[PDB]
Enzyme design. Structure first.
Site, PDB file in Angstrom:
ATOM      1  N   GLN A  26       0.777  -1.223   0.000  1.00  0.00           N
ATOM      2  CA  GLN A  26       0.000   0.000   0.000  1.00  0.00           C
ATOM      3  C   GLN A  26       0.815   1.282   0.000  1.00  0.00           C
ATOM      4  OE1 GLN A  26      -0.482   1.083   4.581  1.00  0.00           O
ATOM      5  NE2 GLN A  26      -1.601  -0.786   4.148  1.00  0.00           N
ATOM      6  N   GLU A  92      -4.276   3.360   0.476  1.00  0.00           N
ATOM      7  CA  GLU A  92      -4.926   3.489   1.770  1.00  0.00           C
ATOM      8  C   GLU A  92      -5.244   4.974   1.964  1.00  0.00           C
ATOM      9  OE1 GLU A  92      -2.646   2.356   5.115  1.00  0.00           O
ATOM     10  OE2 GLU A  92      -4.023   3.192   6.588  1.00  0.00           O
ATOM     11  N   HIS A 119       4.301  11.640  -6.291  1.00  0.00           N
ATOM     12  CA  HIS A 119       3.057  11.260  -6.967  1.00  0.00           C
ATOM     13  C   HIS A 119       2.844   9.760  -6.952  1.00  0.00           C
ATOM     14  CE1 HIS A 119       6.249  11.282 -10.224  1.00  0.00           C
ATOM     15  NE2 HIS A 119       5.711  10.114 -10.556  1.00  0.00           N
ATOM     16  N   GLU A 165       0.394  10.411 -11.984  1.00  0.00           N
ATOM     17  CA  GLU A 165       0.977  10.246 -13.309  1.00  0.00           C
ATOM     18  C   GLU A 165       0.102   9.276 -14.099  1.00  0.00           C
ATOM     19  OE1 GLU A 165       5.024   9.189 -13.094  1.00  0.00           O
ATOM     20  OE2 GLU A 165       5.169   8.506 -15.171  1.00  0.00           O
TER      21      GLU A 165
HETATM   22  N1  LIG Z   1      -4.455  10.495  12.657  1.00  0.00           N
HETATM   23  C1  LIG Z   1      -3.764   9.491  11.801  1.00  0.00           C
HETATM   24  C2  LIG Z   1      -4.781   8.414  11.342  1.00  0.00           C
HETATM   25  C3  LIG Z   1      -4.167   7.140  10.668  1.00  0.00           C
HETATM   26  C4  LIG Z   1      -3.487   6.143  11.632  1.00  0.00           C
HETATM   27  O1  LIG Z   1      -3.398   6.452  12.823  1.00  0.00           O
HETATM   28  N2  LIG Z   1      -3.062   4.985  11.123  1.00  0.00           N
HETATM   29  C5  LIG Z   1      -2.352   4.014  12.020  1.00  0.00           C
HETATM   30  C6  LIG Z   1      -2.379   2.662  11.290  1.00  0.00           C
HETATM   31  S1  LIG Z   1      -4.086   2.007  11.121  1.00  0.00           S
HETATM   32  C7  LIG Z   1      -3.863   0.223  11.043  1.00  0.00           C
HETATM   33  O2  LIG Z   1      -3.033  -0.282  11.795  1.00  0.00           O
HETATM   34  O3  LIG Z   1      -4.589  -0.598  10.191  1.00  0.00           O
HETATM   35  C8  LIG Z   1      -5.468  -1.487  10.969  1.00  0.00           C
HETATM   36  C9  LIG Z   1      -6.381  -2.287  10.034  1.00  0.00           C
HETATM   37  C10 LIG Z   1      -6.340  -1.888   8.696  1.00  0.00           C
HETATM   38  C11 LIG Z   1      -7.132  -2.560   7.767  1.00  0.00           C
HETATM   39  C12 LIG Z   1      -7.946  -3.620   8.169  1.00  0.00           C
HETATM   40  N3  LIG Z   1      -8.769  -4.332   7.193  1.00  0.00           N
HETATM   41  O4  LIG Z   1      -8.300  -5.011   6.183  1.00  0.00           O
HETATM   42  O5  LIG Z   1     -10.071  -4.343   7.271  1.00  0.00           O
HETATM   43  C13 LIG Z   1      -7.977  -4.003   9.518  1.00  0.00           C
HETATM   44  C14 LIG Z   1      -7.185  -3.338  10.452  1.00  0.00           C
HETATM   45  C15 LIG Z   1      -0.912   4.518  12.379  1.00  0.00           C
HETATM   46  O6  LIG Z   1      -0.332   5.204  11.513  1.00  0.00           O
HETATM   47  N4  LIG Z   1      -0.150   4.033  13.376  1.00  0.00           N
HETATM   48  C16 LIG Z   1       1.311   4.338  13.335  1.00  0.00           C
HETATM   49  C17 LIG Z   1       2.021   5.276  14.290  1.00  0.00           C
HETATM   50  O7  LIG Z   1       1.786   6.501  14.174  1.00  0.00           O
HETATM   51  O8  LIG Z   1       2.865   4.856  15.146  1.00  0.00           O
HETATM   52  C18 LIG Z   1      -3.023  10.146  10.595  1.00  0.00           C
HETATM   53  O9  LIG Z   1      -2.038   9.546  10.111  1.00  0.00           O
HETATM   54  O10 LIG Z   1      -3.430  11.237  10.141  1.00  0.00           O
HETATM   55  N1  LIG Z   2      13.343  17.664 -10.077  1.00  0.00           N
HETATM   56  C1  LIG Z   2      12.231  16.693 -10.216  1.00  0.00           C
HETATM   57  C2  LIG Z   2      12.768  15.387 -10.859  1.00  0.00           C
HETATM   58  C3  LIG Z   2      11.710  14.291 -11.214  1.00  0.00           C
HETATM   59  C4  LIG Z   2      10.839  14.536 -12.456  1.00  0.00           C
HETATM   60  O1  LIG Z   2      10.834  15.649 -12.996  1.00  0.00           O
HETATM   61  N2  LIG Z   2      10.102  13.520 -12.914  1.00  0.00           N
HETATM   62  C5  LIG Z   2       9.132  13.892 -13.999  1.00  0.00           C
HETATM   63  C6  LIG Z   2       8.665  12.583 -14.625  1.00  0.00           C
HETATM   64  S1  LIG Z   2      10.053  11.648 -15.398  1.00  0.00           S
HETATM   65  C7  LIG Z   2       9.091  10.374 -16.245  1.00  0.00           C
HETATM   66  O2  LIG Z   2       7.864  10.518 -16.132  1.00  0.00           O
HETATM   67  O3  LIG Z   2       9.611   9.318 -16.902  1.00  0.00           O
HETATM   68  C8  LIG Z   2      10.399   9.444 -18.126  1.00  0.00           C
HETATM   69  C9  LIG Z   2      10.854   7.986 -18.367  1.00  0.00           C
HETATM   70  C10 LIG Z   2      10.714   7.238 -17.184  1.00  0.00           C
HETATM   71  C11 LIG Z   2      11.049   5.894 -17.174  1.00  0.00           C
HETATM   72  C12 LIG Z   2      11.522   5.329 -18.357  1.00  0.00           C
HETATM   73  N3  LIG Z   2      11.952   3.935 -18.372  1.00  0.00           N
HETATM   74  O4  LIG Z   2      11.322   2.942 -17.833  1.00  0.00           O
HETATM   75  O5  LIG Z   2      13.080   3.654 -18.958  1.00  0.00           O
HETATM   76  C13 LIG Z   2      11.651   6.081 -19.529  1.00  0.00           C
HETATM   77  C14 LIG Z   2      11.308   7.435 -19.539  1.00  0.00           C
HETATM   78  C15 LIG Z   2       7.927  14.771 -13.504  1.00  0.00           C
HETATM   79  O6  LIG Z   2       7.593  14.778 -12.312  1.00  0.00           O
HETATM   80  N4  LIG Z   2       7.247  15.481 -14.420  1.00  0.00           N
HETATM   81  C16 LIG Z   2       6.064  16.282 -14.005  1.00  0.00           C
HETATM   82  C17 LIG Z   2       6.343  17.774 -13.817  1.00  0.00           C
HETATM   83  O7  LIG Z   2       7.232  18.123 -13.000  1.00  0.00           O
HETATM   84  O8  LIG Z   2       5.656  18.608 -14.444  1.00  0.00           O
HETATM   85  C18 LIG Z   2      11.467  16.444  -8.877  1.00  0.00           C
HETATM   86  O9  LIG Z   2      10.248  16.163  -8.971  1.00  0.00           O
HETATM   87  O10 LIG Z   2      12.084  16.534  -7.795  1.00  0.00           O
HETATM   88 ZN   LIG Z   3      -1.072   1.791   6.279  1.00  0.00          ZN
HETATM   89 ZN   LIG Z   4       6.532   8.793 -11.856  1.00  0.00          ZN
END
Ligand SMILES: N[C@@H](CCC(=O)N[C@@H](CSC(O)OCc1ccc([N+](=O)[O-])cc1)C(=O)NCC(=O)O)C(=O)O
Ligand SMILES: N[C@@H](CCC(=O)N[C@@H](CS[C@H](O)OCc1ccc([N+](=O)[O-])cc1)C(=O)NCC(=O)O)C(=O)O
Ligand SMILES: [Zn+2]
Ligand SMILES: [Zn+2]
Lengths: 176, 183
Positions: A26, A92, A119, A165
């Site tokens: 995730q 998530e 992204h 993207e």
């Molecule tokens: N105020 C928080 C809310 C999100 C949050 O607290 N998420 C917790 C994991 S949940 C979780 O554990 O997930 C529990 C669960 C998920 C999915 C399922 N399911 O598949 O149904 C069942 C159970 C967390 O990040 N704990 C880490 C820490 O900060 O130390 C925030 O990040 O903004």
């Molecule tokens: N200074 C930047 C660097 C990273 C960057 O610019 N990545 C660009 C997509 S490259 C890309 O998408 O990919 C080009 C490519 C990738 C993989 C392959 N491959 O698998 O070989 C071939 C070609 C991006 O974010 N463009 C959106 C924008 O800024 O407007 C930053 O975001 O920190």
């Molecule tokens: Zn999580």
């Molecule tokens: Zn990308």
């Protein structure tokens, strides 16, 4: 400058046997308004809501979105949880209750200071036809396919402004 | 009641009311990557491959724009195509990859660091890896000097952990088959 291919590989290690079966499950993003985000990820992007979890004491909900067939979601509660959380490539979305009412609140997308996350990206069969549909649906764009330097690559925004993207794996090699 | 009540959590019904079935045009879409900017690619490659067992499946360099991209994924190294163009099409069509962006020079800038999204201003929270045994994985992580946000038996959710990578991005370590007995 950049690393050479050989240098990059020298920095890599073989997978330890203890990491067998590990999977990248995730990416978690916080969303201001789950009604808007659920509409976007399901109606616009075609993902499926595979699990919803609510935590009343801590005042938050989790929405798991993924590209899965809705008919594969188990009926039983515990089976459903185990299935949703073992799917690869899920999103998530965390909703901290009350953010939709706060006019001064918004989450940061990571693309202006301070930067970090940039992204998520969706691979599609055809970036142009996907983006034509997104345009028809009124999706906000950072970059349309032929905008700027890399032709055939797009960046759209979700309801919180996170960048997504839109790429065609078979056209990445000839980008520019 | 008179005043519009504060927004709270959505009911299950309210959430489903905002969900639409997938249009056929999106039937082959896949969630391919999460992009994170990394200060030092050498440290990040070592972490993701040696500590977490991921594989470097593609590397891209952009000399004019002064950045490189490193794609990491849980893939068998033997599936990586030999040809440059086939390799790219395969790597960028894999689900669940991490795209690590190295802006040249950040590794030597002592005043520079990226933001992990977990302090103001917040946004992105973490990536998460599903493992077969959280406790054994975290014992190994501790042996390796991995930085923790939450050890498995720390806090309220026992059996779930959060570690950090070289840039401080949070990484959840969870066992999907035990998540239902959490709470
Ligand atoms: N105020 C928080 C809310 C999100 C949050 O607290 N998420 C917790 C994991 S949940 C979780 O554990 O997930 C529990 C669960 C998920 C999915 C399922 N399911 O598949 O149904 C069942 C159970 C967390 O990040 N704990 C880490 C820490 O900060 O130390 C925030 O990040 O903004
Ligand atoms: N200074 C930047 C660097 C990273 C960057 O610019 N990545 C660009 C997509 S490259 C890309 O998408 O990919 C080009 C490519 C990738 C993989 C392959 N491959 O698998 O070989 C071939 C070609 C991006 O974010 N463009 C959106 C924008 O800024 O407007 C930053 O975001 O920190
Ligand atoms: Zn999580
Ligand atoms: Zn990308």
């Amino acid at each position: 400058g950049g690393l050479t291919d050989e240098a990059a590989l020298s920095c890599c290690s073989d997978a330890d046997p203890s990491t067998k079966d590990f999977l990248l499950q995730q990416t978690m993003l916080r969303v201001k308004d789950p009604k808007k985000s659920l509409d976007f990820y399901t109606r616009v992007l075609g993902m499926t809501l595979i699990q919803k979890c609510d935590f009343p004491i801590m005042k938050f909900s989790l929405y798991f979105l993924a590209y899965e067939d809705k008919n594969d979601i188990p009926k039983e509660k515990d089976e459903k949880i185990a299935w949703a959380l073992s799917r690869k490539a899920t999103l998530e979305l965390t909703h901290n209750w009350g953010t939709e009412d706060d006019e001064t609140q918004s989450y940061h997308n990571g693309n202006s200071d301070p930067r970090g996350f940039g992204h998520i990206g969706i691979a599609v069969p055809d970036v142009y036809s996907a983006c034509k549909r997104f345009e028809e649906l009124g999706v906000k764009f950072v970059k349309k396919p032929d905008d700027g330097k890399m032709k055939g690559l797009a960046f759209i925004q979700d309801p919180d402004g996170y960048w997504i993207e839109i790429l065609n794996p078979n056209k990445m090699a000839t980008l520019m």
